[PDB]
């Protein structure tokens, strides 16, 4: 989730769970040639792989 404060992690902390995600994804048509298996998305800055 974005614009929220994550819990600081130490040794033995419980698993971090997010129930209502704040992220939104756009599926866009590639502007150049892409292979058959590649799908291009637009994601917010606070989203990792």
């Amino acid at each position: 989730a974005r614009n929220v404060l994550y819990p600081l992690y130490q040794l033995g902390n419980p698993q971090l769970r997010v129930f209502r995600t704040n992220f939104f994804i756009q599926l866009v048509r590639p502007g150049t040639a892409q292979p058959e298996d590649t799908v291009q998305f637009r994601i917010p800055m606070e989203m990792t792989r």
Binding site: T32, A33, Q34, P35, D37, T38
Partner: protein, 387 residues
């Protein structure tokens, strides 16, 4: 009393494309007039233009398919066709070979104790690497009595192999050189775990003009989607030793997959068919660089093609699963202006991955596959033809 018409070749100092081709053909003839093979390699590799860097051990989802297009290689499933020669076959005691190989496994796994490992993760890169060093040394010495060639051969341990070639053409999309035609250049920087080099070339598997029904796959995307990244540095053609070395040919290769390409890692990343892709991609890129470098050390290049097929063998392994490959190089004119009419193709026979041992524990190897050992023995028993 006979008219002497001047030739009708294009101009030499003009800006036209025909003039540029004649300028290109001018330096092509410079390589021909060169005598020493070192001077030919200097002229071909003295330009430092942009090029793609090809890694034999890659994480691409479909790497073998893309590497075949860069190489003009058609992959044939199964071992290469048998030589169909039943000349007196050596008698090898498997028990001695089995004990020797098992000793290599037991040492690096259970007997030879290491410094305390805090992670306790037991990285297979640090365990399988010394195992390959002993396995190659143990089998080379044991089979030297049956194969006299291995006695005179040289062993290389982690020695770099380089190769450089042009493939296809490209029109530059962006920059001030927009719209002009520039060839695509590729580079292979490989570091085989072990090498065996022989003064005499191994015999061919199939004739030079071998027509195979299957065709080389053709991609419909830029190589940047593999992904591949362009870089500029020295263009080197290397065989494991400089040209002055009398051992200009090769026998076999041994490759160890890194930690990032383990079977367990691929399963977690939800990759089932990628297990065989990594083995195939490693063999095609590594063997081609080795076979290609051998040809260019003999003077053969794009405009001279190849007279005798160059054959090298490869054994890709990860520590427990072994794969066997054979590569024959028939084509060296991969340039776009030189591949217009070249029916010949490069062939790379391959084998499915097979385990060697199974749940080794407490100086006891539970499972063992002799066919993998027998296949490894067959590779090391290949001999050059004698006259």
């Amino acid at each position: 009393p006979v008219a002497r018409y001047p030739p009708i070749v294009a101009s030499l100092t003009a800006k036209s494309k025909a003039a540029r081709q004649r300028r290109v053909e001018q330096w092509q003839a410079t390589v021909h007039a060169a005598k020493s093979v070192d001077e030919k390699l200097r002229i071909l590799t003295k330009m430092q233009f942009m090029k793609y860097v090809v890694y034999p051990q890659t994480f691409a989802l479909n790497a073998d398919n893309w590497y075949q297009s860069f190489t003009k290689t058609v992959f044939l499933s199964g071992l290469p066709p048998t030589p169909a020669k039943l000349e007196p076959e050596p008698t090898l005691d498997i028990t001695a070979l089995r004990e020797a190989v098992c000793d290599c496994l037991l040492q690096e796994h259970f007997f030879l104790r290491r410094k305390k490992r805090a992670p306790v993760i037991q990285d297979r890169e640090a365990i399988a690497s010394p195992f390959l060093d002993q396995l190659v040394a143990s089998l080379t010495g044991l089979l030297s009595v049956h194969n006299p060639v291995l006695a005179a051969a040289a062993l290389d341990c982690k020695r770099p192999v380089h190769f450089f070639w042009l493939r296809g053409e490209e029109i530059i999309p962006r920059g001030h050189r927009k719209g002009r035609v520039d060839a695509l250049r590729y580079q292979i920087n490989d570091k085989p775990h072990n090498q065996i080099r022989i003064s005499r070339q191994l015999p061919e598997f199939v004739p030079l003009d071998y027509s195979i029904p299957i065709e080389v796959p053709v991609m419909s995307c830029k190589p940047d989607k593999l992904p591949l990244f362009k870089r500029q540095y020295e263009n080197t053609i290397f065989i494991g030793s400089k040209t002055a070395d009398p051992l200009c040919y090769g026998h076999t290769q041994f490759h160890l997959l890194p930690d990032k390409l383990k079977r367990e890692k691929l399963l977690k990343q939800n990759c089932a068919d990628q297990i065989e892709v990594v083995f195939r991609a490693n063999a095609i890129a590594s063997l081609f660089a080795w076979t290609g470098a051998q040809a260019m050390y003999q003077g053969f290049w794009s405009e001279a093609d190849v007279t005798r097929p160059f054959v090298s063998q490869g054994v890709i392994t990860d520590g427990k699963y072994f794969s066997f490959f054979c590569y024959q190089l028939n084509t060296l004119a991969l340039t776009a202006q030189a591949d217009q009419n070249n029916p010949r193709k490069n062939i790379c026979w391959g084998t499915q991955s097979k385990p060697l041992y199974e749940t080794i524990e407490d100086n006891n190897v539970k499972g063992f596959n002799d066919d993998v050992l027998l296949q490894l023995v067959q590779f090391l028993l290949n001999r050059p033809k004698e006259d």
